[PDB]
Design a protein around this ligand. Structure first.
Ligand SMILES: *[C@@H]1O[C@H](CO)[C@@H](O)[C@H](O)[C@H]1NC(C)=O
Ligand SMILES: *[C@H]1O[C@H](CO)[C@@H](O)[C@H](O)[C@H]1NC(C)=O
Length: 532
């Protein structure tokens, strides 16, 4: 049977799924790790023990325990990101969409979800792998990994909660794909990992980590890079936040054993309930439990690793969206609301700058403010709003990614950069948010090919070009068709630094994606806060 696959861990049984008038196979909820429950909470993941019998892989698995967005109850714009399944610490599963008939050795694409390392599910509608598997005949895999404290609590030194275990969860899924994707017709020598936001930083992290690089071929990073200011912390900060977590649960804090034993007695929701209380500053775009620079997964600091070329050299494709910061401002910055144009006052702008560059002294704040204020129209509320939107996206997504692409390109074997700036015709979020963080995902996963979702025709063509670029690049290391007549996405080089826009219009090539602002964020400001 086409829905029966025998792997190294046991026999698995799929289900047939209709997709665009046709059908493909889907193996939902295949387990790749022992449930990290009980005393295994915070611990490294363990390999799933092989099983006898047939594993029912016809329905989605549980989503990992996470914080749930209740900012707009019933709003699809935000609920579409929430877990659409029962949450459970027993969540280490992966999903596979396989063309029908089953290929023999085809290109593999592994998806790593975003969610700031505190949230995210592999079972979300926008992550449905069937359209991409089908349209590009690639074997699509979506893994899962523990988030929040469960996946990132870090008490360096202890082996009970070493930190980075969520990253390890992902590595174990990539190990399992390496080991078994062949039986599903996947070519293990050609797996491309790709993700968005935290999933993007994750991708860059496996490129960086020595223990992870031999497990994939190529990489795609959407709106995220490993060196992101919000994606990692020192062991001291990790430790400092774990203890704080404990102090919120009235835990004995005399020793790591004491702490950890207590955290393990608490029900998931108690940890999730005080999770946000541990951030060191009042901040926007910062999350409690994230990867830690521990000396193991990350041998040394990310910067020294990038500087030395201490990383997997291969091809990479990555880019960002035009208005990456609007979400974070809508959620916590004063003056922004879902149903108003969110025109910001000078004072709210300033409240905003403070909230966006948390780790900044007065001198630093004045510099960001000077860099983004039109002193000839400083009370223009739309300018203040958009300025603040740029500050958040440049500081948190674009400049770190630009810094990563520039360091990477020096030793890599091929870079392709995009700037995605088409705003979806059916976006339920307000106009002022622009081309929102996370809204290139639906084009990557091909939702515009399904009529009832109401995209325009030019949108479906974009989705197809994007899907074909992603899959062609995964297949070859180049997004362009060997001899197509379509315009060529040029390669990004240290010298030219070319990139392309990604929208419904005829492809345009440009250079130095936000240099002016990224020289400020990657060179000037850091140099200024270090002297002050
Ligand atoms: C990639 O590597 C191959 C062989 O190692 C080399 O011949 C080719 O020029 C490289 N391409 C880039 C963009 O570095
Ligand atoms: C397993 O998949 C779902 C689980 O709820 C169930 O509806 C289905 O009948 C089961 N199939 C088999 C073969 O066990």
């Amino acid at each position: 049977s086409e829905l029966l696959v025998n792997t190294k861990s046991g026999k698995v049984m799929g289900t047939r799924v209709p997709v665009l008038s046709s059908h493909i196979s889907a193996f939902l909820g295949i387990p790749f790790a022992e449930p990290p429950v009980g005393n295994m909470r915070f611990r490294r993941p363990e390999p799933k023990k092989p099983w006898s019998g047939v594993w029912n892989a016809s329905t989605y698995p549980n989503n990992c325990q996470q914080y749930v967005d209740e900012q707009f109850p019933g709003f699809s714009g935000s609920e579409m990101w929430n877990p659409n399944r029962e949450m459970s610490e027993d969540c280490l599963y992966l999903n596979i969409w396989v063309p029908s008939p089953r290929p023999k050795s085809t290109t593999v694409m592994v998806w790593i979800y975003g969610g700031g390392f505190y949230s995210g599910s592999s079972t979300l509608d926008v992550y449905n792998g069937k359209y991409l598997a089908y349209t590009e005949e690639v074997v699509l895999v979506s893994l899962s990994y523990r988030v929040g404290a469960f996946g990132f609590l870090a008490l360096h030194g202890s082996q009970e909660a070493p930190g980075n275990v969520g990253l390890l969860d992902q590595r174990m899924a990539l190990q399992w794909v390496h080991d078994n994707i062949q039986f599903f017709g996947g070519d293990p020598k050609t797996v491309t990992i790709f993700g968005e936001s935290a999933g993007g930083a994750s991708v860059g992290m496996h490129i960086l980590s020595p223990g992870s690089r031999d497990l994939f071929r190529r990489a795609i990073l959407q709106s995220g890079s490993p060196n992101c200011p919000w994606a990692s912390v020192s062991v001291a900060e990790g430790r400092r936040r774990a203890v704080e977590l404990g102090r919120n649960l009235n835990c004995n804090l005399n020793s790591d054993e004491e702490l950890i034993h207590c955290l393990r007695e608490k029900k998931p929701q108690e940890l999730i309930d005080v999770e946000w209380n541990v951030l060191p500053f009042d901040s926007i775009f910062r999350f409690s439990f994230v990867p830690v620079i521990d000396g193991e997964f990350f041998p040394t600091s990310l910067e020294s690793m990038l500087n030395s070329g201490n990383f997997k050299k291969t091809q990479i494709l990555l880019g960002v969206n035009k208005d990456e910061g609007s979400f974070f401002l809508l959620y916590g910055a004063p003056g922004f609301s879902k149903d108003s144009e969110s025109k910001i006052s000078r004072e709210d702008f300033m409240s905003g700058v403070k909230l966006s560059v948390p780790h900044a002294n007065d001198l630093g704040l004045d510099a960001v403010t000077l860099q983004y204020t039109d002193w000839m129209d400083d009370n223009n509320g739309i300018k203040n709003r958009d300025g603040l939107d740029d500050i958040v996206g440049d500081h948190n997504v674009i400049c770190p990614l630009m810094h990563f692409v520039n360091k990477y390109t020096k030793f890599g074997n091929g870079t392709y950069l995009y700037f995605f700036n088409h705003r979806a015709s059916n976006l339920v979020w307000p106009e002022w948010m622009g081309v929102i963080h996370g809204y290139e995902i639906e084009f990557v996963f091909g939702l515009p090919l399904v009529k009832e979702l109401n995209y325009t025709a030019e949108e479906e063509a974009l989705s197809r070009r994007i899907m074909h670029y992603w899959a062609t690049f995964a297949k070859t290391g180049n997004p362009n068709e060997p001899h197509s007549q379509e315009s060529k996405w040029p390669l990004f080089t240290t010298k030219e630094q070319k990139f392309i826009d990604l929208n419904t219009e005829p492809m345009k090539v440009h250079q130095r994606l936000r240099v002016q602002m990224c020289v400020f964020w990657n060179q000037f400001l850091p140099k200024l806060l270090n002297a002050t």
